Amino acid sequence: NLCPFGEVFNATRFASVYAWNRKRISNCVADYSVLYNSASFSTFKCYGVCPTKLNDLCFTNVYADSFVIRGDEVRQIAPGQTGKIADYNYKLPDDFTGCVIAWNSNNLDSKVGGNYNYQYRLFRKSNLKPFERDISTEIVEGFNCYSPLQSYGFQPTNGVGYQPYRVVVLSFELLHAPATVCGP
Amino acid sequence: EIVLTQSPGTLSLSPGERATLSCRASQTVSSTSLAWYQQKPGQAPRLLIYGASSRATGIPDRFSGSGSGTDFTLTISRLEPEDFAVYYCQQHDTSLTFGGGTKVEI
Amino acid sequence: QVQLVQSGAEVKKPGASVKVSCKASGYPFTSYGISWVRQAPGQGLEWMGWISTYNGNTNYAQKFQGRVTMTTDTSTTTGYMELRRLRSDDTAVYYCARDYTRGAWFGESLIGGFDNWGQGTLVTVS
Ligand SMILES: *[C@@H]1O[C@H](CO)[C@@H](O)[C@H](O)[C@H]1NC(C)=O
């Protein structure tokens, strides 16, 4: 039984950042070389773990989070980082043990005139905790009253920093329990 | 479900000539859900292009395609004796359906 | 390499059922779903349904609802489809193919198509 990595990476539709998706991988063999040696990714940085040693490690759970953000927002998907995405949409903790993988999706997630299906959270009273999700819609708009979510300007003719990127984050969990996922 | 119509019905072309096959959807279809197939007489259908721009393993580089919105195209840069077959467009954005199919013959 | 193998031609009476097998090898069985498509004489490709080899979940075309049952046997890496209440309009060649349009575990939509098609099984109703 092989882990359904392709089912996550080769998906037709990704979730917006404020409402990021999560799936749990367990009870399977995890071949990570299919991701590490892939030329389709622009980003593949691991924290707390070496990307070439993954096939020799066993975990109790592997969690795959996915969302779409701008190119210039990719740097905020990391430990110790701050910003509108890091603080109000998707927060990672200081002692993360996982890998962040991202690639350009300009030819999938944009259209002439701009694709505004994806939106990001702009206003919040406070910052998010690690792996917290907030999809509330609380502000009538008016003077000093604003909608919490702001649409993205994903146009196909935008510069690289403003193009859409698909991001998948693989978090590695080790409990006081027998591992369920091992490499070859 | 989304209706797929292909045109022209039948193509009459010599070997060595270029061919273009069109498929028009009644509804918008994402490129991620659009594919093309080829069927030779007496044989099962074969996947040629998946995602509307990526070709299946074993498919010659003379086969390509692209599209957006409701208009997608399959292009054969040069017709070989082995390229004369019935081609189909398929979508799985809503349920899963196939178009009527288009025949290319000498 | 990957190959799907089906049974030979069958002849059934009206009202009878037909069970068509599809033996699949050359790949991890539980990693890919199985699709079924039929082609009547002079016609195009008509989708019947889809089954996952991981959790047994199915997805059928409305046209065939109530008449088609799908199952899998992991130990022999073989899929099966049964078409019940055969009519004169059900004469066709029934094909199996290896699916990558729907996820086997979660049922998500994927970028891909049907490949490694079998030779097809001809079923005649008379
Ligand atoms: C995604 O699909 C491509 C073929 O289109 C395949 O080469 C690649 O390995 C798949 N990705 C994963 C993680 O399986």
Side-chain angles (χ1 to χ4, degrees), chain A residues 1-49 51-115 117-124 128-137 139 142 146 148-175 177-179 181-184, chain B, chain C residues 2-126:
Chain A
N1 187 40
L2 304 181
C3 295
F5 283 107
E7 191 168 336
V8 175
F9 282 93
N10 271 300
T12 61
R13 300 156 168 80
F14 278 53
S16 312
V17 62
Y18 80 94
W20 49 273
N21 189 273
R22 170 173 286 181
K23 295 179 176 71
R24 194 200 77 198
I25 297 169
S26 282
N27 293 311
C28 57
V29 178
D31 185 1
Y32 296 97
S33 72
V34 304
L35 301 175
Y36 176 72
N37 290 320
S38 171
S40 70
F41 300 128
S42 65
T43 299
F44 199 108
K45 48 185 32 178
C46 289
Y47 302 90
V49 64
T52 61
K53 299 293 187 181
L54 290 170
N55 285 337
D56 294 323
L57 303 173
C58 294
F59 307 100
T60 59
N61 291 298
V62 180
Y63 298 90
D65 294 346
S66 65
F67 48 87
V68 178
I69 58 173
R70 289 173 291 188
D72 288 348
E73 295 180 317
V74 172
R75 73 157 182 86
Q76 301 166 36
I77 310 303
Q81 300 301 303
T82 65
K84 298 296 183 181
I85 300 304
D87 294 307
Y88 303 120
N89 292 271
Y90 185 77
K91 180 76 175 183
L92 294 177
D94 193 316
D95 53 336
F96 180 67
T97 290
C99 300
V100 179
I101 300 168
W103 64 101
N104 187 283
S105 59
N106 194 55
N107 63 320
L108 301 176
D109 290 319
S110 75
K111 66 180 187 178
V112 174
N115 184 335
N117 297 11
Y118 302 105
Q119 308 197 38
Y120 76 93
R121 178 166 299 271
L122 180 61
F123 296 97
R124 196 171 192 268
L128 294 175
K129 293 181 180 179
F131 304 117
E132 188 178 359
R133 184 191 292 107
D134 184 341
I135 58 169
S136 66
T137 59
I139 299 301
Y146 308 94
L149 304 176
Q150 165 56 14
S151 89
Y152 270 123
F154 285 142
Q155 294 181 327
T157 61
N158 285 345
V160 172
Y162 298 99
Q163 289 177 14
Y165 282 72
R166 287 178 173 202
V167 181
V168 178
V169 180
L170 302 177
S171 174
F172 296 123
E173 180 174 70
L174 219 167
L175 303 174
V181 177
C182 294
Chain B
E1 295 187 356
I2 302 171
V3 176
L4 302 177
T5 299
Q6 293 177 238
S7 67
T10 303
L11 285 80
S12 177
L13 293 168
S14 296
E17 293 180 343
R18 182 167 293 178
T20 302
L21 308 177
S22 298
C23 181
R24 177 169 289 164
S26 68
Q27 300 182 18
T28 301
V29 177
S30 174
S31 63
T32 59
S33 298
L34 195 278
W36 290 88
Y37 297 79
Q38 180 185 7
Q39 179 176 38
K40 293 181 177 177
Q43 301 188 355
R46 180 176 66 175
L47 178 66
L48 265 53
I49 293 280
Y50 62 83
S53 63
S54 312
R55 73 176 56 82
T57 302
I59 304 299
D61 58 348
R62 66 181 177 272
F63 291 92
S64 69
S66 70
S68 68
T70 57
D71 287 282
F72 292 82
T73 300
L74 177 68
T75 301
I76 304 170
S77 67
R78 176 182 162 90
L79 290 168
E80 298 293 349
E82 297 293 319
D83 296 332
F84 292 89
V86 178
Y87 294 85
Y88 303 90
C89 61
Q90 176 260 308
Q91 68 84 30
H92 55 274
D93 195 66
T94 299
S95 188
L96 194 149
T97 65
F98 293 90
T102 298
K103 183 178 181 184
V104 182
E105 63 181 358
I106 299 170
Chain C
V2 176
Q3 183 179 24
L4 271 61
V5 179
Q6 298 180 239
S7 66
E10 296 285 344
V11 180
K12 299 289 185 179
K13 302 296 186 184
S17 63
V18 61
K19 183 175 180 178
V20 180
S21 67
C22 182
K23 183 178 179 180
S25 66
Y27 68 99
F29 184 74
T30 61
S31 297
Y32 298 87
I34 301 169
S35 64
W36 290 87
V37 179
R38 71 176 187 173
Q39 184 173 29
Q43 311 307 308
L45 306 178
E46 182 172 67
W47 181 67
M48 293 178 74
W50 172 93
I51 184 163
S52 171
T53 58
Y54 174 74
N55 56 27
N57 289 335
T58 59
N59 184 31
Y60 295 97
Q62 183 64 57
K63 184 172 181 177
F64 294 92
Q65 186 177 68
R67 295 209 298 149
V68 179
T69 299
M70 292 178 181
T71 189
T72 63
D73 184 345
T74 302
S75 74
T76 60
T77 63
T78 299
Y80 302 90
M81 178 181 73
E82 181 180 61
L83 175 62
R84 297 183 179 185
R85 299 182 180 177
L86 287 168
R87 295 180 180 181
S88 65
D89 293 322
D90 291 313
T91 298
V93 179
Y94 294 79
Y95 293 91
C96 62
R98 184 168 66 88
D99 177 64
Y100 197 73
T101 66
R102 297 292 300 274
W105 287 44
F106 303 101
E108 295 289 353
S109 295
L110 304 176
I111 302 168
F114 296 164
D115 208 344
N116 299 121
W117 294 60
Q119 81 275 28
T121 298
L122 175 65
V123 180
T124 298
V125 182
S126 180

